[PDB]
């Protein structure tokens, strides 16, 4: 069930800032956005991707924050605009000027 | 500032009896609450006055008739007591502010800023009159160039509120003189959105579609109206003016309109209608059209005026596509296809054919709809001679007149 | 609006002192101005401004949809009567 | 040749950060003004040896905005634009910054 998987991310993420590091807390954010993309609510998915895009633009070098840009492309795709999907493909490309970013990312 | 577009739309529904009382009685409850909160009592006087007869009878400023079915447009005497009290609290603060900052250094800029605030407070309570004066003093003395354009657009904003076409027009004229002096892209975007609405109220939709479709792509909501109203208002005026090829480019394959998806009932209504026109479906077009009118045109103040024209033209446009593509139809097949009958179709066609829109006849005897749209030289020659005949007359008047003196 | 382009005939012919005797002279045989006569006679001409949205003064360009009766009530009717007919076809 | 032999010897300095920012100042009006006033970003990140390098940012910035189909220049359009112009210089500066003696 979509519901329960979503619930386990909610417990973890609160715990991720008063027992654990920030690094974990922004990872679980993608996870939430990934399953809302499965549930077929786009308002939720986009809204999480915006929070990551802005705050960790300063802290962008992470293989984890390439995935943010990819997911963003996958959401603008399903909204049927391929101007901003392309644009956010192009953003992903800059943040993986590297071909030494994790292989799974590259395949995506 | 902000609550003006909200109040106006909500206030309009009440007047209209083509919309269901369920929507109206909701609308009033939201807006009555805003009316005490923001002190919109001067605008509230304007509303019951302007109709007059058919709503705005149940008040304490009118003698009560059965004509009005809102009593949520009915004043309190409490309302006036706060009105005055608030008016004094705020206005008094701002005066002290002018008298303080005549002493302190650089009064050209500071005094002007308190006169900018006087307009804000007047915009808040919905009295455009005393606002006109205070923003005029702000323009006159030294402020930033782009801020002069913001000051004008605020004046014009109040003109949409009351809904005088002649006042908004003049305010927008000073903006478009000042538009390239400031060079501002920021108040140029703002200009398309404001000037969008004015063109929407004009019967001219060609300039309304050019501004309102462009303003989708980079849209400003800093001291502006919602994107929800503009995406709908933009689709309507694009549907009329654009032809099938450009319809596809600028409405349907618009990435911005796509991304907004179906989240307002209005948006859903006009979206349906363009697609079904495009993909050549006729069965479903007839009930879509009805829904678009009910939920979109009417609630809107500015398309109330163009409501009737929309229905006529829309039928005319779907007929045009069909009539072009066929030499002959049956009265049977055409009627069934749109989803009406033989008796109904005969009336729909008796409107537009004697006006010479569709250029077609219906054989009643045979049972067919024959097509006789001229595309030949004869059609073309007629267009040409109409241009030269307006010339020959205009030469005759200018020529003669000079000959005498 | 008067024949052709009204704005061209406005621009063409203006007041002069030469033209003043002539304008009057013309007007008097026709008799009176028949724009200030009328409202005395009829007790006001009631031009709609509460019944149209392009008034009787003409704000911009007029709808010709005020010659017809609102045809939305008619199409709404037309549709329903077909659904029942359609059903039982 | 010799100083003052044709009178007036005036060396033109390479521009300071404050000067780079002013050279940038004027091109911004000509372009669409940035959202978020990120003018200082460019100026801090690098300082050139020419008024040409500054100018090079303006043009570079409009390649990226054009593609995104957004007119207005932004911080993101800027970050890509300063990275492109600084690329030319970082590469010749890593070879004396690394693998040296």
XYZ file of C-alpha atoms in Angstrom:
703
model
C 0.000 0.000 0.000
C 1.144 3.461 -1.060
C -0.212 4.847 2.176
C 2.037 2.919 4.602
C 5.269 3.386 2.564
C 4.605 7.099 2.607
C 4.032 7.002 6.406
C 7.433 5.302 7.170
C 9.251 8.265 5.264
C 7.211 10.736 7.488
C 8.428 9.187 10.725
C 11.991 8.967 9.570
C 12.281 12.530 8.276
C 11.201 14.145 11.576
C 13.718 11.900 13.293
C 16.356 13.159 10.861
C 17.179 16.358 12.543
C 17.222 15.559 16.264
C 18.928 12.190 16.109
C 20.411 12.376 12.618
C 22.087 14.634 10.078
C 20.578 16.964 7.389
C 22.060 14.699 4.705
C 19.539 11.986 5.405
C 16.597 14.484 5.816
C 16.841 15.784 2.173
C 17.184 12.237 0.800
C 13.858 11.272 2.235
C 12.313 14.243 0.546
C 12.998 12.775 -2.908
C 11.515 9.503 -1.591
C 8.222 11.199 -0.677
C 8.114 12.977 -4.092
C 8.881 9.673 -5.919
C 5.841 7.862 -4.339
C 3.396 10.842 -4.915
C 4.533 10.605 -8.560
C 3.123 6.950 -8.234
C -0.082 8.008 -6.444
C -0.796 10.553 -9.234
C -0.837 13.768 -7.320
C 1.615 16.247 -9.080
C 1.065 19.326 -6.838
C 2.813 17.403 -3.932
C 5.690 16.090 -6.028
C 6.527 19.439 -7.539
C 6.251 21.202 -4.260
C 8.881 18.956 -2.572
C 11.184 19.359 -5.624
C 11.019 23.109 -5.276
C 12.121 23.017 -1.604
C 15.222 20.940 -2.498
C 15.991 23.062 -5.624
C 16.326 26.234 -3.851
C 17.913 25.463 -0.509
C 20.498 23.024 -1.742
C 21.375 25.086 -4.768
C 24.079 26.380 -2.370
C 24.982 22.931 -1.312
C 24.842 21.482 -4.938
C 27.654 19.131 -5.811
C 25.757 16.003 -4.528
C 24.882 12.963 -6.752
C 21.694 13.011 -4.583
C 20.716 16.508 -5.927
C 21.160 15.466 -9.590
C 18.167 13.128 -8.962
C 16.107 16.230 -7.885
C 16.505 17.644 -11.406
C 15.692 14.411 -13.120
C 12.495 13.940 -11.040
C 11.561 17.431 -11.906
C 11.853 16.576 -15.569
C 9.700 13.413 -15.065
C 6.971 15.625 -13.365
C 6.974 18.411 -16.145
C 6.765 15.484 -18.674
C 3.471 14.263 -17.139
C 2.192 17.795 -16.971
C 2.781 17.552 -20.814
C 5.089 20.620 -21.143
C 8.410 19.554 -22.645
C 9.891 23.142 -22.631
C 10.532 22.999 -18.850
C 11.270 19.223 -18.938
C 14.090 20.000 -21.413
C 15.180 22.965 -19.418
C 15.459 20.830 -16.207
C 17.262 18.057 -18.320
C 19.788 20.747 -19.185
C 20.048 21.637 -15.398
C 20.769 17.985 -14.580
C 23.487 18.020 -17.292
C 25.402 20.871 -15.571
C 25.366 19.240 -12.282
C 26.747 16.082 -13.904
C 29.488 17.800 -16.012
C 31.068 14.680 -14.482
C 30.714 11.210 -15.972
C 31.919 10.074 -12.443
C 28.544 10.551 -10.864
C 26.930 7.270 -9.814
C 26.142 5.016 -12.834
C 22.473 4.604 -12.077
C 22.057 8.316 -12.377
C 23.793 8.376 -15.680
C 21.515 5.606 -17.072
C 18.524 7.705 -16.024
C -5.030 46.915 -3.567
C -5.259 43.062 -3.619
C -8.927 42.491 -2.397
C -10.396 44.633 -5.286
C -10.440 41.904 -7.905
C -11.697 39.411 -5.419
C -14.618 41.502 -4.131
C -15.701 42.504 -7.641
C -16.062 39.107 -9.079
C -17.914 37.822 -6.017
C -20.239 40.882 -5.922
C -21.135 40.336 -9.664
C -22.510 36.834 -9.132
C -25.166 38.138 -6.787
C -26.580 40.427 -9.445
C -26.915 37.574 -12.029
C -29.896 35.159 -11.729
C -28.727 32.894 -14.492
C -26.281 31.350 -11.922
C -27.759 29.143 -9.236
C -28.408 30.615 -5.737
C -26.146 28.078 -4.229
C -23.048 29.777 -5.811
C -24.347 33.317 -5.002
C -25.144 32.707 -1.395
C -21.643 31.239 -0.899
C -20.039 34.202 -2.661
C -21.845 36.769 -0.498
C -20.975 35.101 2.792
C -17.152 35.191 1.886
C -17.309 38.826 0.703
C -19.535 40.320 3.485
C -16.788 39.076 5.837
C -14.130 40.888 3.823
C -16.370 44.077 3.621
C -16.323 44.648 7.481
C -12.622 43.542 7.747
C -11.084 45.839 5.100
C -13.776 48.639 5.556
C -15.016 48.469 1.943
C -18.118 50.442 2.972
C -17.730 53.227 0.193
C -17.603 50.466 -2.510
C -20.514 48.772 -0.764
C -22.655 51.991 -1.393
C -21.470 52.046 -4.988
C -22.719 48.460 -5.504
C -26.397 48.794 -4.458
C -26.663 52.100 -6.320
C -25.289 51.139 -9.693
C -27.708 48.362 -10.746
C -30.505 50.018 -9.932
C -33.679 47.733 -9.869
C -32.959 43.965 -9.727
C -30.848 43.401 -6.554
C -29.715 46.221 -4.287
C -33.241 46.812 -2.927
C -32.611 45.092 0.520
C -30.525 47.711 2.291
C -31.061 50.417 4.733
C -30.233 52.952 1.923
C -33.033 51.831 -0.348
C -36.628 50.824 0.545
C -36.902 47.095 0.541
C -38.493 45.340 -2.470
C -38.836 41.597 -3.261
C -36.559 42.133 -6.298
C -33.322 41.572 -4.350
C -32.920 37.998 -2.942
C -29.724 38.992 -1.147
C -29.972 40.420 2.315
C -26.286 39.745 2.679
C -25.804 43.066 0.710
C -27.794 44.727 3.532
C -25.862 47.229 5.721
C -25.268 47.534 9.438
C -25.101 50.796 11.292
C -22.124 49.183 13.240
C -20.238 49.149 9.973
C -20.383 52.956 9.641
C -19.194 53.350 13.338
C -15.999 51.353 12.708
C -15.587 52.974 9.214
C -15.102 56.397 10.540
C -13.017 55.214 13.540
C -10.531 53.281 11.355
C -10.466 56.150 8.720
C -9.250 58.549 11.489
C -6.721 56.069 13.060
C -4.783 55.453 9.871
C -5.255 58.760 8.039
C -4.084 60.662 11.231
C -0.879 58.573 11.393
C -0.009 59.430 7.783
C -0.547 63.186 8.300
C 1.773 63.274 11.250
C 4.286 61.479 9.031
C 4.154 64.408 6.352
C 4.548 67.119 9.062
C 7.503 65.210 10.688
C 9.431 64.701 7.413
C 9.136 68.337 6.163
C 11.820 69.016 8.764
C 14.101 66.040 8.325
C 16.560 66.018 5.510
C 15.526 65.080 1.928
C 11.758 65.830 2.154
C 11.297 65.450 -1.668
C 11.496 61.735 -1.516
C 9.936 61.157 2.001
C 6.824 63.339 1.843
C 6.169 61.627 -1.529
C 6.366 58.169 0.064
C 3.716 59.174 2.695
C 1.580 60.411 -0.177
C 2.087 56.926 -1.882
C 0.736 55.329 1.457
C -2.324 57.608 1.423
C -3.305 55.957 -1.828
C -2.805 52.534 -0.427
C -5.178 53.185 2.431
C -7.700 54.723 0.059
C -7.364 51.689 -2.322
C -7.982 49.446 0.755
C -11.360 50.923 1.583
C -12.492 51.291 -1.984
C -12.923 55.108 -2.401
C -11.084 55.930 -5.636
C -11.728 59.690 -5.318
C -9.451 60.897 -2.569
C -6.861 58.357 -3.828
C -6.632 60.145 -7.244
C -5.501 63.317 -5.524
C -2.915 61.771 -3.151
C -1.115 59.742 -5.902
C -1.020 62.846 -8.085
C 1.146 64.577 -5.445
C 3.476 61.506 -5.408
C 4.031 61.670 -9.184
C 4.765 65.409 -9.074
C 7.827 65.359 -6.709
C 10.992 63.384 -6.876
C 10.831 59.586 -6.730
C 12.344 56.795 -8.872
C 11.078 56.613 -12.521
C 9.762 53.014 -12.411
C 7.864 53.935 -9.113
C 5.923 56.647 -11.145
C 4.633 53.882 -13.419
C 3.564 51.761 -10.354
C 1.730 54.752 -8.998
C -0.251 55.166 -12.284
C -1.144 51.427 -12.501
C -2.610 51.598 -8.946
C -4.845 54.443 -10.095
C -5.829 52.388 -13.020
C -6.456 49.368 -10.755
C -9.166 51.320 -8.888
C -10.699 52.229 -12.248
C -11.274 48.402 -12.992
C -12.840 48.166 -9.504
C -15.536 50.636 -10.165
C -15.532 49.494 -13.875
C -15.406 52.751 -15.769
C -13.798 52.139 -19.222
C -13.107 55.819 -19.911
C -11.108 56.329 -16.622
C -8.886 53.180 -17.000
C -8.115 54.154 -20.609
C -6.612 57.531 -19.668
C -4.630 56.105 -16.876
C -3.140 53.481 -19.235
C -2.314 56.207 -21.797
C 0.150 57.882 -19.369
C 1.682 54.453 -18.594
C 2.373 53.720 -22.289
C 4.034 57.215 -22.829
C 6.188 56.443 -19.678
C 6.714 52.848 -20.677
C 10.030 53.078 -22.714
C 11.407 56.073 -20.680
C 11.664 53.781 -17.624
C 12.482 50.857 -20.023
C 10.985 48.627 -17.419
C 10.244 45.153 -18.386
C 8.666 44.734 -15.010
C 5.909 47.322 -15.544
C 5.767 46.370 -19.239
C 4.596 42.920 -18.223
C 2.191 44.531 -15.794
C 0.997 46.800 -18.586
C -0.004 43.729 -20.780
C -2.078 42.237 -17.889
C -3.902 45.458 -17.042
C -4.306 46.437 -20.611
C -5.517 42.823 -21.279
C -8.565 43.417 -19.173
C -9.420 46.730 -20.819
C -9.202 45.048 -24.327
C -11.311 42.141 -22.969
C -14.084 44.649 -22.164
C -13.657 46.205 -25.643
C -15.390 44.190 -28.321
C -12.034 43.976 -30.033
C -10.595 40.614 -29.098
C -7.650 40.614 -31.489
C -5.538 42.922 -29.272
C -7.028 41.110 -26.112
C -5.657 37.673 -27.483
C -2.217 39.166 -28.405
C -1.668 40.635 -24.930
C -3.238 37.897 -22.735
C -1.637 34.853 -24.398
C 1.887 36.492 -24.168
C 1.360 37.440 -20.595
C 0.892 33.674 -19.847
C 4.448 32.949 -20.520
C 6.007 35.545 -18.114
C 3.166 36.534 -15.744
C 3.549 38.921 -12.824
C 1.205 38.631 -9.741
C 3.165 41.316 -7.703
C 0.209 43.726 -7.086
C -1.753 42.026 -9.837
C -4.581 39.607 -10.308
C -4.585 35.767 -10.188
C -3.209 33.542 -12.943
C -6.475 31.587 -12.644
C -8.598 34.396 -13.985
C -5.954 35.298 -16.703
C -5.407 31.706 -18.089
C -9.245 31.397 -18.561
C -9.711 34.957 -19.901
C -6.734 34.282 -22.321
C -8.168 31.009 -23.638
C -11.592 32.648 -24.427
C -10.157 35.455 -26.481
C -7.640 33.179 -28.251
C -10.471 30.742 -29.209
C -12.298 33.449 -31.069
C -9.500 35.176 -32.889
C -7.076 32.438 -33.778
C -7.703 30.155 -36.615
C -7.187 26.336 -36.417
C -3.529 26.329 -37.294
C -2.546 29.054 -34.647
C -5.144 27.585 -32.250
C -2.966 24.537 -32.042
C 0.258 26.535 -31.572
C -0.847 29.018 -28.973
C -3.633 27.440 -26.921
C -3.485 23.619 -26.954
C 0.347 23.276 -27.377
C 0.912 26.134 -24.935
C 3.227 24.541 -22.230
C 1.947 27.027 -19.526
C -1.710 26.298 -19.981
C -0.735 22.566 -19.860
C 1.045 22.801 -16.651
C -1.877 24.626 -14.912
C -3.985 21.493 -15.651
C -7.638 21.169 -14.500
C -7.874 22.783 -11.047
C -10.504 25.469 -11.631
C -13.936 24.570 -13.016
C -13.710 27.532 -15.345
C -10.382 26.320 -16.725
C -11.802 22.816 -17.279
C -14.843 24.234 -19.154
C -12.920 26.272 -21.860
C -10.227 23.651 -22.223
C -12.793 21.061 -23.181
C -14.372 23.277 -25.750
C -11.154 24.113 -27.768
C -10.026 20.424 -27.944
C -13.402 19.159 -29.221
C -13.456 21.965 -31.889
C -9.925 20.971 -32.916
C -10.249 17.162 -33.111
C -13.440 17.459 -35.153
C -15.841 15.989 -32.742
C -19.428 17.325 -32.814
C -21.488 15.103 -30.495
C -19.871 16.444 -27.392
C -19.394 20.058 -28.523
C -23.072 20.946 -28.097
C -23.325 20.188 -24.271
C -19.663 21.644 -23.712
C -20.718 25.044 -25.055
C -23.590 25.255 -22.638
C -21.310 24.459 -19.688
C -18.670 27.029 -20.797
C -21.386 29.789 -20.748
C -22.805 28.766 -17.367
C -19.545 28.543 -15.373
C -17.108 30.880 -17.143
C -18.687 33.746 -19.165
C -21.312 34.803 -16.632
C -19.358 34.945 -13.393
C -16.955 37.151 -15.243
C -18.083 40.713 -15.331
C -16.290 41.613 -18.574
C -17.440 38.555 -20.669
C -21.020 39.075 -19.472
C -21.008 41.763 -22.174
C -19.597 39.352 -24.784
C -21.664 36.339 -23.570
C -24.226 36.343 -26.459
C -21.473 36.840 -29.152
C -19.567 33.882 -27.872
C -22.534 31.556 -28.385
C -23.202 32.807 -31.929
C -19.665 32.793 -33.207
C -18.833 29.462 -31.619
C -21.617 27.680 -33.569
C -20.535 29.710 -36.598
C -16.944 28.566 -36.275
C -17.821 24.811 -35.961
C -20.171 25.186 -38.942
C -17.481 26.871 -41.014
C -15.109 23.858 -40.672
C -17.902 21.486 -41.584
C -19.266 23.565 -44.505
C -15.772 23.978 -45.982
C -14.974 20.372 -45.950
C -18.235 19.260 -47.521
C -20.102 20.106 -50.634
C -23.377 18.684 -49.290
C -24.679 17.351 -45.955
C -28.022 16.073 -44.968
C -30.159 17.981 -42.450
C -30.448 14.568 -40.883
C -26.722 13.879 -40.532
C -25.651 17.371 -39.524
C -28.257 17.656 -36.797
C -27.522 14.157 -35.339
C -23.779 14.756 -35.394
C -23.910 17.972 -33.293
C -26.394 16.153 -31.138
C -29.624 18.074 -31.903
C -32.550 17.364 -34.113
C -33.934 18.275 -37.463
C -36.449 20.870 -36.026
C -33.748 22.519 -33.851
C -31.072 22.705 -36.581
C -33.354 24.492 -38.966
C -33.688 27.455 -36.390
C -29.966 27.571 -35.580
C -29.170 28.005 -39.220
C -31.948 30.714 -39.742
C -29.889 33.088 -37.610
C -26.582 33.079 -39.246
C -27.395 32.477 -42.917
C -29.513 35.749 -43.486
C -26.571 37.674 -42.019
C -24.328 36.090 -44.631
C -21.852 34.296 -42.506
C -21.778 30.759 -43.724
C -22.840 31.209 -47.343
C -24.997 28.140 -47.639
C -28.522 27.040 -48.337
C -30.699 24.217 -46.953
C -32.918 22.304 -49.297
C -36.034 21.697 -47.181
C -37.655 19.749 -50.110
C -34.691 17.364 -50.723
C -33.606 17.110 -47.054
C -29.943 18.269 -47.652
C -27.812 21.175 -46.536
C -26.178 22.402 -49.794
C -22.963 24.372 -49.758
C -22.358 27.311 -51.942
C -19.501 29.213 -50.422
C -17.960 31.266 -53.449
C -14.087 31.030 -53.415
C -13.853 32.219 -57.001
C -12.840 35.561 -58.677
C -16.315 37.009 -58.253
C -15.975 36.922 -54.416
C -12.617 38.511 -54.612
C -13.643 41.346 -57.100
C -16.414 42.285 -54.681
C -13.939 42.815 -51.831
C -11.769 44.922 -54.069
C -14.448 47.266 -55.265
C -15.602 47.888 -51.686
C -12.070 49.333 -50.973
C -11.979 51.596 -54.008
C -15.572 52.906 -53.461
C -14.692 54.258 -49.966
C -11.641 55.932 -51.697
C -13.710 57.550 -54.537
C -16.105 59.135 -52.029
C -13.278 60.355 -49.698
C -11.457 62.002 -52.689
C -14.754 63.658 -53.697
C -15.238 65.237 -50.202
C -11.507 66.347 -49.636
C -11.104 67.552 -53.292
C -14.375 69.663 -53.393
C -13.891 71.209 -50.004
C -10.464 72.675 -50.881
C -11.821 73.740 -54.312
C -14.300 76.264 -52.606
C -11.939 78.037 -50.203
C -22.607 58.527 -37.548
C -23.504 59.910 -40.875
C -22.774 58.610 -44.445
C -19.350 57.017 -45.131
C -16.869 58.282 -42.556
C -18.375 60.881 -40.173
C -14.978 61.846 -38.887
C -13.844 62.891 -42.359
C -16.973 65.272 -42.700
C -16.316 66.728 -39.278
C -12.752 67.479 -40.176
C -13.844 68.898 -43.582
C -16.376 71.473 -42.604
C -16.079 73.812 -39.653
C -17.478 77.266 -38.642
C -16.290 80.435 -40.387
C -17.911 83.846 -40.327
C -18.584 83.469 -44.040
C -20.311 80.166 -43.463
C -22.493 81.330 -40.487
C -25.252 83.188 -42.458
C -25.564 80.141 -44.729
C -25.776 77.446 -42.076
C -28.615 79.362 -40.326
C -30.428 80.248 -43.500
C -30.518 76.550 -44.485
C -31.579 75.422 -41.099
C -34.587 77.836 -40.907
C -36.384 76.543 -44.094
C -36.076 73.030 -42.786
C -37.433 74.764 -39.546
C -35.812 74.622 -36.104
C -33.010 72.293 -35.014
C -35.263 69.295 -34.136
C -33.070 68.019 -31.325
C -34.102 70.588 -28.705
C -37.743 70.578 -30.024
C -38.208 66.853 -29.499
C -37.799 66.436 -25.695
C -40.428 69.223 -25.080
C -42.915 67.215 -27.222
C -42.399 63.652 -26.105
C -41.421 64.362 -22.462
C -37.956 62.919 -22.765
C -36.625 60.279 -25.112
C -35.767 57.133 -23.107
C -32.642 55.704 -24.574
C -31.736 52.440 -22.977
C -28.516 52.271 -20.750
C -29.936 49.660 -18.345
C -30.901 47.130 -20.927
C -27.823 46.878 -23.210
C -24.069 46.714 -22.432
C -23.041 48.808 -25.436
C -25.801 51.235 -24.433
C -27.604 53.543 -27.081
C -24.623 56.027 -27.004
C -22.157 53.328 -28.192
C -19.141 52.911 -26.053
C -17.016 51.289 -28.786
C -18.525 49.100 -31.466
C -22.066 47.646 -31.003
C -23.294 44.056 -30.557
C -26.114 43.135 -32.971
C -27.045 40.448 -30.462
C -29.556 42.832 -28.817
C -31.773 42.439 -31.900
C -32.020 38.810 -30.977
C -33.285 37.362 -27.772
C -30.707 35.611 -25.541
C -30.299 32.328 -27.504
C -28.565 30.561 -24.497
C -32.024 29.722 -23.006
C -32.944 28.506 -26.459
C -29.816 26.139 -26.897
C -30.092 24.941 -23.362
C -33.826 23.989 -24.324
C -32.824 22.492 -27.604
C -30.302 20.092 -26.080
C -32.585 18.677 -23.399
C -35.467 17.997 -25.811
C -33.080 16.098 -28.087
C -31.775 13.938 -25.131
C -35.288 12.684 -24.387
C -35.981 12.254 -28.159
C -32.523 10.661 -28.653
C -33.213 8.188 -25.884
C -36.455 7.046 -27.221
C -35.196 6.991 -30.903
C 59.679 55.710 -27.475
C 61.042 57.800 -24.593
C 58.765 59.048 -21.644
C 57.256 62.403 -22.620
C 58.856 62.364 -26.135
C 55.347 62.401 -27.438
C 53.794 63.917 -24.368
C 51.588 62.145 -21.828
C 52.207 58.506 -20.971
C 49.036 57.091 -19.449
C 48.834 53.487 -18.385
C 45.232 52.161 -18.332
C 44.725 49.808 -15.350
C 42.946 46.493 -15.538
C 39.591 47.036 -13.825
C 39.048 46.628 -10.033
C 36.039 44.680 -8.610
C 34.192 47.929 -7.952
C 34.906 48.951 -11.615
C 33.844 45.514 -12.981
C 30.559 45.946 -11.081
C 29.969 49.388 -12.659
C 30.835 48.057 -16.158
C 28.249 45.335 -15.414
C 25.793 47.981 -14.112
C 25.091 49.535 -17.487
C 24.674 46.372 -19.502
C 22.046 45.148 -17.036
C 19.562 47.919 -18.133
C 20.177 47.152 -21.688
C 19.404 43.529 -20.900
C 16.405 42.650 -18.678
C 17.110 43.451 -15.091
C 18.051 40.432 -12.919
C 15.567 38.982 -10.378
C 16.991 38.824 -6.909
C 19.882 41.415 -7.601
C 22.653 39.033 -8.102
C 25.025 41.650 -9.689
C 27.533 41.357 -6.898
C 27.833 37.607 -7.436
C 29.622 38.040 -10.869
C 31.905 40.763 -9.562
C 33.139 38.751 -6.530
C 33.632 35.481 -8.475
C 36.230 36.860 -10.916
C 37.868 40.137 -11.886
C 39.176 40.530 -15.408
C 42.008 42.125 -17.061
C 39.630 43.739 -19.583
C 36.243 45.474 -19.842
C 35.755 42.870 -22.571
C 35.554 39.949 -20.131
C 32.705 41.713 -18.261
C 30.888 42.290 -21.525
C 31.495 38.534 -22.372
C 29.306 37.589 -19.312
C 26.343 39.649 -20.625
C 26.242 37.827 -23.968
C 26.951 34.415 -22.444
C 24.082 34.926 -19.939
C 21.623 35.541 -22.839
C 22.507 32.170 -24.464
C 21.260 30.364 -21.434
C 18.023 32.507 -20.881
C 17.163 32.063 -24.518
C 17.238 28.397 -24.392
C 15.201 28.174 -21.148
C 12.629 30.450 -22.791
C 12.627 32.984 -20.001
C 13.712 36.607 -21.005
C 14.609 37.921 -17.581
C 18.069 37.158 -16.408
C 18.251 35.330 -13.057
C 20.895 34.093 -10.520
C 20.886 30.674 -12.188
C 21.434 32.239 -15.674
C 24.259 34.160 -13.976
C 25.927 31.128 -12.276
C 26.014 29.302 -15.637
C 27.336 32.528 -17.293
C 30.216 33.271 -14.887
C 31.198 29.457 -14.992
C 31.473 29.542 -18.753
C 33.691 32.690 -18.770
C 35.849 31.503 -15.880
C 36.490 28.088 -17.598
C 38.859 29.634 -19.964
C 41.084 30.818 -17.107
C 40.755 28.030 -14.463
C 42.292 25.494 -16.877
C 45.500 27.446 -17.397
C 45.627 28.115 -13.572
C 45.410 24.460 -12.485
C 48.651 23.665 -14.164
C 50.596 26.037 -11.988
C 48.332 25.334 -9.010
C 48.863 21.583 -9.202
C 51.693 19.460 -10.537
C 54.171 22.234 -9.867
C 57.645 21.434 -8.337
